[PDB]
Amino acid sequence: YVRQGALIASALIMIQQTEITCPKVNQFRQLYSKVINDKHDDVMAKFGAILAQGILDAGGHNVTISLQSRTGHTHMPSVVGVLVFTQFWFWFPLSHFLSLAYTPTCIIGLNKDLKMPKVQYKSNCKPSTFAYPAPL
């Protein structure tokens, strides 16, 4: 019961936080896949371990769940999804709702015909310290 809740919660933080920003990401990633392959654990525990995997890794290492909205009140589709998610014990299909929380993280500047380009913005970080999460 503690294991299932702790492990899901970890997954929510780790999205777009990488192996070269905490060792924790290495430990967590490895642990997910180990559970599915093995039968060592009790089945109750595995349900939590496997959902937590999809969240951490999500979207090909491209998507994040936001803190808030663009200003003010907490992002509107995101909060709901999570509320219903936490209850999954009585009914398994409730876990699906976590797709709604995922929003792609791109800051977008545009051309004067108003369609996606590859324009640049400056961000002060080091490429030795942030990079997209390494797969399982």
Partner 1 sequence: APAVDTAEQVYISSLALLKMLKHGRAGVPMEVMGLMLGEFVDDYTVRVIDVFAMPQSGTGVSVEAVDPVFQAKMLDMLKQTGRPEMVVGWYHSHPGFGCWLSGVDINTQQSFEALSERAVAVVVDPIQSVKGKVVIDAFRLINANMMVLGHEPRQTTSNLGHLNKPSIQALIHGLNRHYYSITINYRKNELEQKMLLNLHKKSWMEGLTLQDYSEHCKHNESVVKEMLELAKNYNKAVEEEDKMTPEQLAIKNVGKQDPKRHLEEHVDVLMTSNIVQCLAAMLDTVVFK
Chain residues that interact with partner 1, rule: CB under 8 A:
42-44, 47, 89-93
Closest to partner 1 by CB, 54 or 59: 54
Smallest gap, in angstroms, from Cβ of residue 13 to partner 1? 26
Smallest gap, in angstroms, from Cβ of residue 28 to partner 1? 23
Longest Cα separation, the chain? 58
Total residue count of the chain as it appears in this document: 136
Give the angle subtended at the CA of 63 by the CAs of 20 and 17, to the nearest 5°: 20
Closest to partner 1 by CB, 19 or 41: 41
Smallest gap, in angstroms, from Cβ of residue 123 to partner 1? 44
Closest to partner 1 by CB, 92 or 130: 92
Smallest gap, in angstroms, from Cβ of residue 48 to partner 1? 11
Distances in Å between the Cα of 14 and the Cα atoms of 29, 38, 118, 119 are 10, 24, 27, 28
Closest to partner 1 by CB, 42 or 113: 42
| CA 128 – CA 21 distance, rounded (Å) | 9
CA-based torsion, 26, 27, 28, 30: positive or negative: positive
